[PDB]
C-alpha cells in the first residue's frame, strides 16, 4: 500500500477526478431550476484502501487546489479525459503519471509501485459509509466441477502442481465452441478424475485441490 | 413554537432507540438515512409525518406511532424531480395498514400527475394481521396505481430487507428491482408453511435471497454489497433514464470523439470458427468513455443487455455472448431481452443489437418448458418497436435466430455486417446432407459439395445482393457508423395500428 | 375455354395423385378438402392459383409446381366474412419460399384492411432449404404482420400435421392454437439434432406431440380426435367471437330465461370444509342452455377459463377449481388466466369470475421458477381491464389471492358473495398463533381464541360492513343477478392513461 508523499499525491488526484466528473454531471438537461443556483461543498473525505484524508478543494481558475489538514497544499493540473487509461500531469511542482481504472463508485489507481482503491465522499456520506460492515468471502473448496456438458479437449496442469487464482486448468467443448475453465482459488493439484477424450455431464468432477 | 419542534423530533424516532440500534447492528441503515443518501442535499420535502392508525382491535389502540411505519415525500436527484417512499422496519415490522397504504397512494398519484419518476424502498413483512381485511384493501389500491403508471413514468424498487407476502407483488410490476446481498429476501410463502406443506427445511436466504433472485428465478435486475453502494448506483441509473414517456432521453456533454477509429476490432474475431471472444469488449469499446450499466448481469449470461451513451445520449444495447452456451438463444435469454426491448420502446430509447447466433438450444427441457412462446416474445418485442433500431452482424447468423435478432424483415432501420459474417439458413454440412440426401454414401464427394456450399453461401454477400444488408463495413469504423446513423434517425416517426393493447404471449 | 378449365384442374392436383393418396392413407385430409369443410357452401374465392417459384439453384427450375405449396383466399362462416390460408404438404413438404410467403402476406394485409378474422391451417416443414436466405426473409414478413394484427382482428391457428423450425413462431403469436391428436406435432429443433447434441433419443410424438403441448408446455389451447371434428369446432368457436375490436360480441336468440331460479345451488357447497365440489357444474348451470366452450382444459386444471352466453351474448368465465390442488393459485394457472383476460379485454368481451381460493402454492419449486412475476401477470391483466367485470365469491377468499381474483380494489364493477363466503387475511389457527404468540403454551385458551376469531372474522360481514362487497346474495339467484348486472354494464366507458404500451412482466 502507499505511504508518505506518494499516498498524498494519489489522494489529490482522486479529488481532482471526482471534481471534474461532478462538474459535467451538473449540466444534465431537464432540471427543475437553473444549476447556477446550486452549491458545491468544499470539504471532502478521500478513502484510500483503509486510510482517510480530509481535504478541501478549490478551483484555481482552470486548475485545482487541494488542501489537507496539515495545512500543506497541492495544485493539480492535467488534460486527462474520462476513458483514457493514464492520468498524466502535475501535482505540486512534480510531474506524475498514474494508471487509472474504473471501480464501482470509485477508481483504482497505480503509482510508484503502489496500488489503491480510491473513493471520495462528503462528510455525512462518509460517516454513513462507516456504518457498513466488512464482509468476508466464503471461499471455494476442494473441487473443480464441470459447469457445462461436453467433451474434454485439453488439460494444462499435472498432479502435484501449484496454481494461482485465475489460471486455466482445462478446456471443454460443447455445441462447436470451446470453454476455458479457470482456477477460482490458489492451491495444489492433488487428483485428476477425467482426462482428454471423455464426455462429462453437468456438475462432474474434473479435479480436486 | 418549540413544541412543534418537539413533536417533529419525536416523530423522527420511529419505534424506539433500541430498535434503531438493532437495525444498525445488522449493518442496515434507517429509512430516513436511506432517503438522505438518495436525494440531493437539502431537497427533501416530507408528507404526512403525523398520520396515525385508527384500529381498535387486539389492543392496537394503545400504541399509536406517528407516521404509521412509512416515510413519504419528494426531492431532487442531480436537479431533476423525483418522488419516493421508504418503509420503517422498526414500526410494526414495516407492515402495511390502511393509513400506510393511503400515504403510498398519495405519492403515487402525485408522481403520475406531475409525470416524474417514483422510487420505492422496501424493508417489511406485508399486511398487518391485526387490521384484517382492511389491510388487504390498501394493498389493492397501491397495486392499481402501479399498473396505471406502467409505461408512463419509470418505477424503481430497492429491496433492503425482508419483503414477504403481498408486498412482493408491488415491486414485481415495476420496471427494475435491485437487492442488497445477505440482508434481503423475497418470497410469497414463508419457510414455516413450506415445512408444514412440503417437508422441506430451508432458511430465508436459501428460499429467497439475492443469489437466487439474481441468478435463477428471473426476478431481480442486480445485487449490491451494501446499502450505500446500492443507493449510489440508483443515483447513477436515474441519470440515464427519461423522466416520462414524453420528454426523451437526458443529454450530457461528452468527453469522447464520434469520429475515432479502433484498429483493434479488426483482430477481435478469431480465425478458428470454434474459438470464442468477449462481446462485452466490443460494447465497452463502442460506448462513450467505456461507461456501461449492465442489467441482469448474473442471469442468462448467453445474452447481454444494458445502457450506454453515444454523443451524450442514452442508448440501449442487446448482444449475443459466445463465451456462454455458444451464444445460443434460449427461453431465459429471450425473456431477459424481450422485457428490456419493451421498456426502451415505451420510453423512446434507441436500441443497438450485436448479433452472433448459431441457433436455438435443443432438447426436451426447452420444448417442455415452452421455448416456442418464450422465443416468440423477443420477436414480438422487436417487431412492435417504433424507436430507432441499428443492428450489426459480426459472425454467424443462422436460421430463425437471424430473423429474431433485429433483422430488416421485422422492421430494423439500418443493418450492417462485418466481413466475417456468415448469413445462411444453416451450417454447410447439414444443408448438404439435406439437399444431397440420396448420395450421402461417398466421402470425398461430400467434402467437395460442402466446400462448394461454404464458398458460395457462408458469407455476407448473398444477403447484400438481395438488399437485406445495407452495407458491409470494416470493424474499425463501427462506432463512427453507429453515431452517424443514430443522429440521422432522431426524427423517425412511426405508429402501430389503433388498439387497446396487443395480446403478446405470457 | 376448355384450356383454362384444364389449367385449373391441373393446378388442383398439387404434388400428384400418389402423394394425395398417401396423405389420405395417413388418415388426413387435403388442404382443399379442409377449406371446403370450414367454409359455407359455395363461398370460397381463391387467390393466386397460378403463382410459381423463381429459384434457379440445385435443379429447382425443372420442377415448377403452380401454387407453390399454399392455398389462399376468402369466404364466409355462418354468413360472416373470413380470410384463410392452408399449407399443402404434398408440394415441397409444405415448405415456405418467397412466393409462398408473398401469397400469405397478401391475405394477411387484406384481413387487416377489411377488419375480419384470419384462420391459418398448418401442415408443413419450414423454410425451403434450396432457396436459402430468401426463404427466411419471407418468414419475417409474415411475422411482422402477425404482430401488427394482434388485438385488432382475431387470429386462429390449426395444426393438422408437422410444424417445425421457423414456422412454429407464427402460430405462437396468434390468439388460439388447436392440434389434432396422433398426427400433428410442433418443435423448434428436431430429434436428429437432439440426439447429436444431448444424446437423448426421442420420437417426434414424444418431443412435440399433442399431449405434450396440451398438458405440460402451455402452448396449445385444445386437441381433437380428427380433422373433421377440429374444423367443426373451429366453426363453433368463430360463432362466439367478435369480428374485430370495434364491432362488439355477436348476438343470437336464446331459448333460456333470465329470471329462472336454481334451488340446487343452495346445496352445492358441502358442510364439511375439507370436502370439494365441481366448479364446472356451477359454470354449466349459469350459462345459457348449458353450452360452454372451454379453453386450455387439460393444462393447469386448478383454474377454469372459457366462453359461454348470457341473454344471447358472449361472456368469458374464469373460476377456481377446488377439485385440483385445493384450488390454489400457481404460476401455470396465473399465466393461463392472464392471457384469457387480456384477450377478452382487447375484444370487448365481459368477464365473470368465480372465487374459491385459499392462497398460493408453497415450495422452493414455485419460488425458484418465478412465482412472484408469473402471479403478478394476472393481477396486472385484471387491473388494466376496462370491460365489465362481475365477481362472485362462493367460499374461501384469503390473503393476496383474494385481491388478485377481480376484487373491488383492482377495479371490479360489482362484487357479490354467497352466505358461505369466508373473506379473511388467513385462517383462524395461523392468525391466532401469530397474534397470540406470547401465550401459545396453553391449549384451552388457544381453542377459545381460535373459536372467537372464527366466529368474528371468517364470514362475509366485515367486508360487507366496509363496502368491499356490494351484496350477500342467495345461491339460487346467481344467474338472475348476473344477467341483470351485465345488461346495466353494457354502457361502461373507461380509458387507461395515454402510452405506447404497458410494461407488463414477461
Ligand atoms: C417479515 C418476516 C420475514 C420477518 O421475520 P424476522 O426478521 O424473524 O422478525 P420478527 O418475526 O421478529 O418480525 C419483527 C416484528 O414485526 C412484527 N411483524 C412482522 N410481520 C408482521 C405483520 N405482517 N403483521 C404484523 N406485525 C408483523 C412482528 O410480529 C415482530 O414484532 P415484535 O418485535 O413485537 O415481536 C416474518 O415476520 C413474516 O413472515 N412476517 C409476515 C407475516 C407472518 O406470516 N409472520 C409470522 C409467520 S412466521
Ligand atoms: C417437417 C418434417 C419434420 C417432416 O418429416 P417427415 O414426415 O419424416 O417427412 P420427410 O422428411 O420425408 O418430408 C417429406 C418431404 O418434404 C421435403 N421437405 C421437408 N422439409 C423441407 C424443407 N425445409 N425444405 C425443403 N424440402 C423439405 C423432404 O425432402 C421430403 O421430400 P421427398 O418425399 O421427396 O423425400 C421434416 O422433414 C423436417 O424436419 N424438415 C425440416 C428440414 C430439416 O431439418 N430436415 C432434416 C431432418 S428431417
Ligand atoms: C455439428 O457438430 C453440429 C452440432 C452443432 C449444432 C448447433 S447446437 C446450437 C445450434 N442449434 C441448432 O439447432 N444447431 C446449432
Ligand atoms: C394446515 O394444515 C396449514 C397448512 C395449509 C395451508 C394451505 S397451503 C395452500 C394455501 N396456501 C397457504 O399459504 N395456506 C393454504
Amino acid at each position: 500500500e502507499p505511504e508518505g508523499p506518494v499516498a498524498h499525491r494519489l489522494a489529490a488526484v482522486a479529488a481532482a477526478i471526482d471534481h471534474k466528473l461532478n462538474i459535467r454531471k451538473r449540466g444534465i438537461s431537464g432540471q427543475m431550476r437553473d444549476p447556477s443556483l446550486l452549491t458545491f461543498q468544499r470539504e471532502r473525505v478521500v478513502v484510500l484502501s483503509g486510510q482517510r484524508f480530509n481535504v478541501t478543494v478549490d478551483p484555481d481558475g482552470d486548475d485545482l487546489l487541494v488542501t489537507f489538514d496539515d495545512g500543506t497544499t497541492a495544485p493539480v493540473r492535467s488534460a486527462w479525459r474520462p476513458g483514457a487509461p493514464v492520468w498524466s500531469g502535475t501535482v505540486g511542482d512534480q510531474s506524475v503519471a498514474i494508471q487509472v481504472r474504473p471501480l464501482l463508485n470509485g477508481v483504482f489507481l497505480q503509482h510508484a509501485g503502489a496500488a489503491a482503491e480510491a473513493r471520495v465522499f462528503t462528510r455525512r456520506e462518509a460517516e454513513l459509509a462507516d456504518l457498513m460492515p466488512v464482509k468476508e468471502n466464503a471461499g471455494s473448496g476442494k473441487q473443480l466441477l464441470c459447469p457445462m456438458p461436453g467433451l474434454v479437449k485439453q488439460i494444462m496442469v499435472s498432479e502435484g502442481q501449484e496454481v494461482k487464482n485465475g489460471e486455466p486448468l482445462a478446456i471443454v467443448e460443447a455445441m462447436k465452441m470451446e470453454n476455458v475453465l479457470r482456477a477460482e482459488r490458489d492451491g495444489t493439484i492433488s487428483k485428476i478424475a477425467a482426462k482428454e477424450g471423455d464426455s462429462l455431464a453437468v456438475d462432474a468432477v474434473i479435479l480436486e485441490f | 413554537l418549540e413544541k412543534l419542534e418537539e413533536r417533529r423530533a419525536q416523530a423522527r424516532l420511529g419505534g424506539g432507540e433500541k430498535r434503531l440500534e438493532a437495525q444498525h447492528k445488522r449493518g442496515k441503515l434507517t429509512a430516513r438515512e436511506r432517503i438522505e443518501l438518495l436525494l440531493d442535499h437539502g431537497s427533501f420535502e416530507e408528507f404526512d409525518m403525523f398520520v396515525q392508525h385508527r384500529s381498535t382491535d387486539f389492543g392496537m389502540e394503545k400504541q399509536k406511532i406517528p407516521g404509521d411505519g412509512v416515510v413519504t415525500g419528494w426531492g431532487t436527484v442531480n436537479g431533476r424531480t423525483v418522488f419516493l417512499f421508504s418503509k420503517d422496519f422498526t414500526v410494526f415490522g414495516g407492515s402495511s395498514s390502511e393509513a400506510h397504504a393511503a400515504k403510498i397512494v398519495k405519492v403515487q398519484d402525485m408522481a403520475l400527475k406531475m409525470r416524474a419518476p417514483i422510487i420505492g424502498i422496501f424493508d417489511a413483512g406485508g399486511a398487518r394481521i391485526q387490521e384484517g381485511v382492511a389491510a388487504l384493501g390498501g394493498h389493492g389500491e397501491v397495486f392499481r396505481r402501479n399498473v396505471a403508471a406502467s409505461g408512463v413514468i419509470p418505477q424503481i424498487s430497492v429491496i433492503m430487507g425482508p419483503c414477504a407476502g403481498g408486498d412482493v407483488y408491488s415491486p414485481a410490476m415495476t420496471d427494475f428491482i435491485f437487492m442488497v446481498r445477505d440482508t434481503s429476501y423475497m418470497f410469497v410463502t414463508g419457510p414455516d408453511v413450506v415445512k408444514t406443506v412440503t417437508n422441506e427445511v430451508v432458511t430465508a436466504e436459501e428460499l429467497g435471497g439475492a443469489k437466487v433472485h439474481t441468478s435463477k428465478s428471473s426476478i431481480a435486475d442486480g445485487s449490491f454489497e451494501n446499502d450505500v453502494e446500492a443507493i449510489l448506483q440508483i443515483r447513477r441509473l436515474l441519470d440515464f433514464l427519461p423522466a416520462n414517456n414524453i420528454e426523451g432521453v437526458p443529454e450530457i456533454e461528452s468527453f469522447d470523439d464520434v469520429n475515432r477509429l479502433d484498429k483493434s476490432l479488426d483482430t477481435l474475431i478469431p480465425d478458428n470458427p470454434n474459438k470464442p471472444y468477449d462481446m462485452g469488449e466490443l460494447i465497452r469499446r463502442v460506448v462513450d468513455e467505456g461507461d456501461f450499466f449492465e442489467i441482469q448481469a448474473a442471469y442468462a449470461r448467453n445474452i447481454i443487455t444494458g445502457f450506454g451513451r453515444v454523443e451524450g445520449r442514452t442508448v440501449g444495447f442487446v448482444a449475443n455472448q459466445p463465451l456462454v452456451l455458444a451464444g445460443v438463444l434460449d427461453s431465459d435469454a429471450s425473456r431477459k431481452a424481450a422485457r428490456f426491448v419493451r421498456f426502451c420502446n415505451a420510453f423512446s430509447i434507441p436500441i443497438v443489437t450485436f448479433v452472433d447466433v448459431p441457433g436455438f438450444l435443443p432438447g426436451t427441457a426447452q420444448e417442455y418448458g415452452g421455448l416456442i412462446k418464450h422465443g416468440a416474445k423477443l420477436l414480438f418485442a422487436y417487431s412492435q418497436a417504433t424507436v430507432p433500431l441499428v443492428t450489426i452482424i459480426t459472425r454467424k447468423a443462422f436460421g430463425g435466430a437471424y430473423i429474431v435478432m433485429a433483422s430488416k424483415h421485422v422492421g430494423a432501420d439500418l443493418n450492417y455486417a462485418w466481413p466475417t459474417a456468415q448469413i445462411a439458413v444453416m451450417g454447410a454440412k447439414g444443408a448438404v446432407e439435406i439437399i444431397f440426401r440420396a448420395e450421402i454414401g461417398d466421402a470425398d464427394k461430400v467434402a467437395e459439395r460442402t466446400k462448394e456450399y461454404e464458398d458460395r453461401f457462408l458469407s455476407p454477400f448473398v444477403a447484400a445482393e438481395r438488399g437485406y444488408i445495407d452495407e458491409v463495413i470494416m470493424p474499425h469504423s463501427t462506432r463512427k457508423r453507429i453515431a452517424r446513423a443514430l443522429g440521422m434517425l432522431r426524427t423517425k416517426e412511426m405508429e402501430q395500428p389503433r388498439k387497446k393493447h396487443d395480446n403478446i404471449p405470457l
Side-chain angles (χ1 to χ4, degrees), chain A, chain B:
Chain A
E1 260 176 30
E3 309 287 0
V6 176
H8 291 262
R9 290 200 286 269
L10 286 171
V13 167
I17 291 168
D18 179 73
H19 192 254
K20 175 175 197 91
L21 299 172
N22 287 336
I23 292 306
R24 190 267 293 283
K25 166 190 304 186
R26 297 202 106 185
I28 194 160
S29 48
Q31 295 181 58
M32 194 171 41
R33 56 179 47 81
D34 194 73
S36 297
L37 313 162
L38 305 153
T39 46
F40 206 93
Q41 313 198 34
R42 292 168 65 259
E43 306 81 15
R44 297 270 159 172
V45 178
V46 186
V47 181
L48 204 66
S49 63
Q51 180 167 212
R52 292 178 62 187
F53 293 86
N54 274 105
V55 301
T56 311
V57 180
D58 302 298
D60 182 8
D62 52 338
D63 312 330
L64 277 158
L65 187 61
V66 181
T67 308
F68 294 69
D69 274 8
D70 314 317
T72 183
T73 61
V76 180
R77 313 184 157 93
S78 188
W80 180 78
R81 288 166 99 85
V86 182
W87 190 104
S88 285
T90 59
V91 183
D93 274 337
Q94 181 149 347
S95 295
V96 295
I98 296 92
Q99 297 296 312
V100 183
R101 310 290 176 259
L103 201 154
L104 192 60
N105 305 122
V107 293
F108 180 73
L109 304 178
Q110 292 150 326
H111 170 68
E117 300 186 343
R119 291 184 177 92
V120 180
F121 309 104
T122 60
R123 303 291 301 291
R124 180 57 168 157
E125 299 186 314
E127 82 196 12
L128 290 170
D130 282 348
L131 300 172
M132 300 290 97
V134 296
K135 297 175 177 186
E136 68 277 16
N137 289 318
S140 68
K142 181 184 159 56
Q143 306 286 92
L144 176 62
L145 280 297
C146 194
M148 69 287 288
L151 279 300
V152 172
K153 187 175 180 180
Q154 187 189 157
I155 287 174
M156 294 73 81
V157 297
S158 61
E159 270 155 50
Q161 193 194 148
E162 182 256 339
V163 300
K164 194 179 290 298
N165 191 320
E167 182 166 6
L169 307 175
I171 299 177
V172 180
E173 182 70 24
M175 289 186 289
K176 301 192 185 118
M177 184 53 71
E178 291 186 35
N179 301 98
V180 173
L181 317 189
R182 290 160 192 284
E184 68 276 16
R185 55 164 289 184
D186 193 315
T188 302
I189 304 302
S190 178
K191 177 265 288 180
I192 295 174
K195 291 180 73 67
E196 289 84 336
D198 50 12
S199 65
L200 304 185
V202 76
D203 283 347
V205 178
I206 300 170
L207 60 82
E208 310 188 27
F209 303 85
Chain B
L1 262 172
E2 296 178 354
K3 162 59 189 81
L4 183 59
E5 291 281 43
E6 197 285 331
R7 189 185 291 257
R8 290 169 169 192
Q10 179 255 313
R12 292 193 195 98
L13 287 187
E17 293 292 329
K18 80 171 285 177
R19 291 198 193 262
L20 293 177
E21 185 60 44
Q23 179 90 332
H24 274 177
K25 281 268 167 56
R26 301 190 195 94
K28 301 158 76 190
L29 302 171
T30 72
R32 287 180 187 275
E33 295 171 338
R34 287 164 177 164
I35 291 172
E36 169 175 20
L37 190 53
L38 172 61
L39 294 177
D40 300 327
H41 186 262
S43 57
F44 179 51
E45 186 184 25
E46 177 169 4
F47 297 158
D48 293 333
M49 174 194 264
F50 296 142
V51 166
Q52 300 188 317
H53 83 254
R54 296 180 291 283
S55 164
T56 44
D57 281 329
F58 299 112
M60 292 306 287
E61 59 277 5
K62 288 180 281 188
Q63 40 197 358
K64 294 170 177 312
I65 304 173
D68 206 16
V70 73
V71 190
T72 49
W74 77 270
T76 52
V77 176
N78 193 16
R80 304 167 75 213
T81 300
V82 307
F83 291 84
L84 74 172
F85 64 89
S86 165
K87 291 178 187 247
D88 193 351
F89 187 70
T90 62
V91 174
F92 314 114
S95 71
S96 176
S97 49
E98 183 160 24
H100 188 100
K103 281 180 70 165
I104 295 170
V105 159
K106 168 179 296 186
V107 62
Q108 279 182 126
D109 282 1
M110 294 194 75
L112 187 57
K113 179 193 307 308
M114 264 60 75
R115 301 291 213 272
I118 185 157
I119 314 304
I121 306 173
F122 291 79
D123 178 1
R128 205 173 293 169
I129 306 303
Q130 290 94 344
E131 290 206 9
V133 300
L136 301 184
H139 267 159
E141 291 292 323
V142 170
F143 295 165
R144 191 184 288 175
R145 271 62 172 193
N146 291 123
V147 176
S150 182
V152 184
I153 56 169
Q155 310 178 81
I156 303 159
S157 305
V158 192
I159 318 306
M160 307 187 90
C163 184
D167 289 345
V168 307
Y169 288 130
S170 168
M173 299 163 127
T174 62
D175 303 299
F176 304 102
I177 306 167
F178 296 95
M179 287 182 82
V180 181
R181 296 200 279 276
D182 314 305
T183 41
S184 66
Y185 44 88
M186 306 172 82
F187 40 70
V188 171
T189 66
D192 309 319
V193 182
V194 166
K195 175 75 177 310
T196 180
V197 174
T198 67
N199 301 122
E200 306 179 309
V201 190
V202 284
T203 68
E205 180 77 40
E206 296 175 354
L207 178 60
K211 179 146 185 52
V212 165
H213 287 317
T214 55
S215 76
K216 176 148 57 183
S217 60
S218 86
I219 301 306
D221 289 80
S223 83
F224 302 111
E225 190 78 9
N226 59 59
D227 289 5
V228 174
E229 177 175 292
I231 288 167
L232 291 184
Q233 285 294 290
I234 301 303
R235 281 187 60 96
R236 182 185 179 209
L237 179 58
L238 277 163
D239 282 357
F240 282 101
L241 294 183
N244 56 56
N245 66 357
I246 305 305
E247 71 174 7
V249 296
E251 312 169 335
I252 68 178
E253 60 272 62
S254 201
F255 297 114
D256 206 323
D257 183 4
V258 297
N259 293 316
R260 68 168 162 90
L261 313 174
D262 197 348
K263 301 287 100 172
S264 66
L265 301 186
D266 293 341
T267 57
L268 182 66
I269 305 301
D271 280 322
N272 188 334
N274 296 339
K275 292 226 171 177
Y277 62 93
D278 190 350
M279 199 52 96
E281 186 179 345
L282 178 62
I283 290 166
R284 290 172 169 74
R285 286 185 160 270
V286 165
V287 297
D288 293 348
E289 307 167 25
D291 190 53
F292 187 63
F293 196 113
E294 191 161 5
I295 301 291
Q296 286 218 79
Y299 178 75
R301 292 177 309 120
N302 49 347
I303 198 158
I304 301 172
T305 57
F307 302 111
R309 292 186 176 87
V310 188
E311 213 164 5
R313 301 173 154 252
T314 296
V315 183
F317 290 82
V318 182
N320 309 105
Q321 169 63 283
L323 292 177
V324 174
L325 296 180
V328 300
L329 272 176
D330 68 352
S331 57
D332 292 5
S334 303
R335 289 173 59 231
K336 169 174 169 190
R339 192 132 189 260
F340 183 79
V341 169
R342 289 259 293 185
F343 175 90
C344 284
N345 191 53
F347 290 99
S348 311
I349 307 176
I351 302 167
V352 176
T353 302
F354 291 101
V355 184
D356 182 354
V357 67
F360 299 90
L361 188 66
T364 56
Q366 280 299 293
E367 287 299 332
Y368 296 170
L371 175 56
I372 290 172
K373 273 178 175 173
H374 292 313
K377 288 176 166 126
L378 177 60
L379 177 58
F380 206 108
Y382 275 122
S383 301
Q384 171 173 65
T386 58
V387 296
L389 296 176
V390 178
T391 301
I392 303 88
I393 301 171
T394 68
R395 214 184 204 186
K396 311 184 282 320
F398 295 166
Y402 150 76
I403 303 167
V404 173
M405 299 292 306
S407 51
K408 178 76 69 206
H409 320 290
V410 300
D413 293 293
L414 272 166
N415 298 83
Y416 301 110
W418 285 9
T420 43
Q422 301 183 319
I423 310 171
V425 62
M426 43 171 67
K429 65 196 305 308
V432 161
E433 287 177 354
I434 292 156
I435 295 170
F436 304 104
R437 57 191 153 266
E439 293 83 3
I440 61 170
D442 203 0
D444 69 330
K445 193 251 194 185
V446 164
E448 184 178 1
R449 303 283 216 186
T450 303
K451 181 266 288 183
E452 192 192 310
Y453 193 97
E454 176 161 348
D455 273 299
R456 280 179 73 200
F457 296 114
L458 269 45
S459 79
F461 294 125
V462 173
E465 279 162 27
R466 303 294 299 250
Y468 302 161
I469 284 296
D470 296 309
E471 188 56 54
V472 182
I473 74 176
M474 292 327 292
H476 65 245
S477 310
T478 294
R479 183 178 157 87
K480 179 170 179 181
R481 295 295 286 261
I482 289 171
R484 196 175 52 185
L486 288 171
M488 176 272 277
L489 294 167
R490 282 181 201 158
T491 51
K492 178 168 182 194
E493 289 107 359
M494 187 192 188
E495 75 280 16
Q496 286 266 310
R498 289 199 211 76
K499 56 183 93 178
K500 275 203 205 171
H501 57 72
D502 65 75
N503 189 27
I504 192 163
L506 301 170

